[PDB]
Amino acid sequence: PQITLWKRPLVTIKIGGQLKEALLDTGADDTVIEEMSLPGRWKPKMIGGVGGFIKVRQYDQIIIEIAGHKAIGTVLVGPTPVNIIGRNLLTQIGATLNF
Amino acid sequence: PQITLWKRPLVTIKIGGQLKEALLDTGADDTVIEEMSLPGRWKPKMIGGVGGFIKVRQYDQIIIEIAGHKAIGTVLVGPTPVNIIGRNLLTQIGATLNF
Numbered sequence A, B: 001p002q003i004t005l006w007k008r009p010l011v012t013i014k015i016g017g018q019l020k021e022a023l024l025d026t027g028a029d030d031t032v033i034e035e036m037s038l039p040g041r042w043k044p045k046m047i048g049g050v051g052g053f054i055k056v057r058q059y060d061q062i063i064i065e066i067a068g069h070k071a072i073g074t075v076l077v078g079p080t081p082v083n084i085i086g087r088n089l090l091t092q093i094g095a096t097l098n099f
């Protein structure tokens, strides 16, 4: 699709068999989602946003569908205001910015 | 242009006579720039994200040049860690996300 930006670019994602809403975020290096159960081990990560840096859990090689496109990659879990799809998965689904 | 997302989508902007680097950020509702002077009236605002909230000054009807493209709209000014061009001005330059 071609998504304009008059509204927030919210899509449906599927992770762990669950549908969730997430924001496509070109300003996010990383994908971060609200607290949920993911398989496997995690590693610690600090991520920086507008208000400062916070600790999240990093799970690697997680299967995730984004707007119907499949991806397998790193998902961070932590106290984010919204589910965010960042550049690490936007690249896998072939997203670009155009103007 | 078509901008891939392998690295941060940074562009040059001109605002208030000044050249700055800024992030094209589909996850940002509005544009927020590091501390600088702008002409006219302003009012305080809080904006929030990962890590919490910051206080900014809201200036309306400000012209920016974004990668060569002029727009006008609200610009927030405050202690953001990165200059961000948000949706309020991305729409005006016709930016879309494509995949």
Ligand SMILES: CC(C)CN(C[C@@H](O)[C@H](Cc1ccccc1)NC(=O)O[C@H]1CCOC1)S(=O)(=O)c1ccc(N)cc1
Binding pocket: A025, A026, A027, A028, A029, A030, A031, A032, A047, A048, A049, A050, A051, A081, A082, A084, A086, B025, B026, B027, B028, B029, B030, B031, B032, B047, B048, B049, B050, B081, B082, B084, B086
């Ligand atoms: C969190 C989203 C919903 C909103 N933010 C935009 C995001 O793109 C934000 C931009 C940014 C990049 C680098 C450092 C600081 C900020 N990236 C972000 O936090 O990256 C994290 C999440 C995972 O990857 C790392 S905002 O900055 O809080 C914000 C809020 C309101 C307005 N009007 C403008 C901006």
Ligand SMILES: [Cl-]
Binding pocket: A019, A020, A021, A022
């Ligand atoms: Cl949800």
Ligand SMILES: [Cl-]
Binding pocket: A035, A036, A037
């Ligand atoms: Cl869960």
Ligand SMILES: [Cl-]
Binding pocket: A010, A011, A012, A013, A066, A067, A068
């Ligand atoms: Cl969708």
Ligand SMILES: [Cl-]
Binding pocket: A072, A073, A074, A088, A089
């Ligand atoms: Cl990844």
Ligand SMILES: [Cl-]
Binding pocket: B053, B054, B055, B079
């Ligand atoms: Cl503050």
Ligand SMILES: [Cl-]
Binding pocket: B072, B073, B074, B088, B089
């Ligand atoms: Cl505006």
Ligand SMILES: [Cl-]
Binding pocket: A004, B094
């Ligand atoms: Cl349009």
Ligand code: NA
Binding pocket: A036, A037, A038
């Ligand atoms: Na868990």
Ligand code: NA
Binding pocket: A039, A040, A041, A059, A060, A061, A062
């Ligand atoms: Na894993």
Ligand code: NA
Binding pocket: B039, B040, B041, B059, B060, B061, B062
């Ligand atoms: Na004004």
